[PDB]
Symmetry: none
Subunit: 56 residues, 6 copies
């Protein structure tokens, strides 16, 4: 499942992923409130807050 970022996000932790509004990412794991994902744009990966994204 691919999701789109609704808002910009600054990585707080180290295992965190930095994305911007509009970015598309592939959800690798739906761990809980925090999901593992890979950016389709930058190619980098990490955890993202699930409340900042929407399922396409």
């Amino acid at each position: 499942i691919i999701v789109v970022a609704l808002y910009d996000y600054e990585a707080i932790h180290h295992e965190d992923l930095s994305f911007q509004k509009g970015d598309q990412m592939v959800v690798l794991e739906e761990s809980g409130e925090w999901w593992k994902a890979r950016s389709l744009a930058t190619r980098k990966e990490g955890y993202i807050p699930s409340n900042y994204v929407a399922r396409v």
Copy 2:
């Protein structure tokens, strides 16, 4: 009734309160995931993600 910011937070919504790690604020309402607060650093008011702060003594 005061909290200290554990991380930086830039307001996303319009009534959101921006704050920097270390900032002290007075909690106005403890309403779940979002709390209403008064900043002692900037003097502004707004909502804050409760998981970004720690209630202290």
Copy 3:
């Protein structure tokens, strides 16, 4: 038993800890004006001035 730093502190000795405002640490010993603690971020241990931190309550 955890506290959060209210201000930045530069270690003046070898046995005490350096921390920045907003940092969280575990208090190992509450012995006087100086407390032994462990930074939750770096795991580092040392003494901290008790007046620079506030207990999470």
Copy 4:
């Protein structure tokens, strides 16, 4: 996905979500007679009586 409140509602339980007439809220879950919602006005969450709101 969003509904507008037709009447004022006082929570009868601790999990309920109180609101006023006209308030807009996002419906999180449509579990029958009681729906889980997030208020756009107060940002709070809880269950609301589904016959008290209208879907837009």
Copy 5:
């Protein structure tokens, strides 16, 4: 709860706190005519005459 000083006060005992009109403090204990409090700016603790402050 937090209070704000209505008037300037000069400490008389060794236990009471000195504060200025407008200062905000956190009430630690509401021990009658003399409440224990903590200045928010100086973090210093001590007793204050309750009739000199207004609870917000």
Copy 6:
């Protein structure tokens, strides 16, 4: 309801009243962002920024 000033304020317009932090004033109108108030100290009347004052409990 009566309010207490959290910060100092200096009147820019001609209808709003200046007040020092600590000043008590009666809220005449809670007209949005700018409340109408009468100062219990200066006895004057005028508008005040609502975010500069706190409500008495």
